[PDB]
Amino acid sequence: EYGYIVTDQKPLSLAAGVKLLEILAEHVHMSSGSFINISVVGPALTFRIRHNEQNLSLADVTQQAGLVKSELEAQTGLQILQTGVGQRE
């Protein structure tokens, strides 16, 4: 499974995707480093999450990203169109 955040940036810069993930991490009170397998493709930022002490899942992080999307946006200078969890087995 993976988490995703679709932006209004076509395409999305790595700097901006990573900046989003760091602001997001601090908002969920975890290490930035707990976000792994990070990519930006098209307007989309993807990632997975490491086994963390706080115990947040991808469901947890993507949910919170939608809840504070207004502060995430204004911090990063981009718009968040949608968030959620993808899966491929």
Nearer to its own copies, 23 or 28 (CB): 28
C-alpha separations of 54 from 38, 59, 75, 78, 88 in Å: 20, 14, 24, 28, 25
Identify the residue among 15, 38, 59, 74 touching its own copies (CB under 8 A).
59
Distance, CA of 6 to CA of 10 (rounded, Å): 10
Alpha-carbon gap, residue 20 to 75, rounded angstroms: 8
Restricted to residues 24-43, the positions that interact with Ca ion (CB under 5 A) are 31-33
Binding flag, residue 75, its own copies (CB under 8 A): no
Contacting positions for its own copies (CB under 8 A): 1, 4, 6, 27-29, 44, 50-51, 54-60, 62-67, 69, 80-89
